[PDB]
Amino acid sequence: RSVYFCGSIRGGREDQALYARIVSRLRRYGKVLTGDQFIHEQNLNWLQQADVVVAEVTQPSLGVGYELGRAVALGKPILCLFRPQSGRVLSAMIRGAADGSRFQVWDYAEGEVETMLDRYFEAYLV
């Protein structure tokens, strides 16, 4: 299995420890895949080859939204992880994209992100 992981970079890195914990655990379930022109090309090539796309969508970010948009049109199964504890309200375009097994948006408490990812890959992935 190949897992594409999205997180905020130029959108801000406030949740980057959370991203390392997500990436470490995604490694229990598959290979984790992840000149602006070359950066876009490289990541698109990875998105196109990915078996599942996982995105942490608490910190707003153009690139994360952009990767989710391209992934949905590709038909790739998607998991978005949102942290309501931030005090943020999740983008309507993201939470509203939710659609069966194809696109799921899970709210999480940060002390449980590892166990939620365990649950997703165990029972919520086709």
Ligand X SMILES: O=P(O)(O)OC[C@H]1O[C@@H](n2cnc3c(NCc4ccco4)ncnc32)[C@H](O)[C@@H]1O
Binding site for ligand X (CB under 6 A): 6-11, 34, 38-39, 42-43, 61-64, 67, 91-93
Measured at the CA of 109, the angle between CA 103 and CA 111, to 5 degrees, comes to 120
CB of 55 to ligand X, least distance (A): 7
Which tokens in the block code for residue 32? Answer: 């984790």
Site track 73-92 with its own copies (rule: CB under 8 A), x = hit: xx-------------xxxxx
Radius of gyration of the chain (CA): 13
22 labeled binding residue: no
Choice between 21 and 95, CB closer to its own copies: 95
Instruction: Please give the Cα distance from 51 to 75 (Å, whole number).
Output: 10
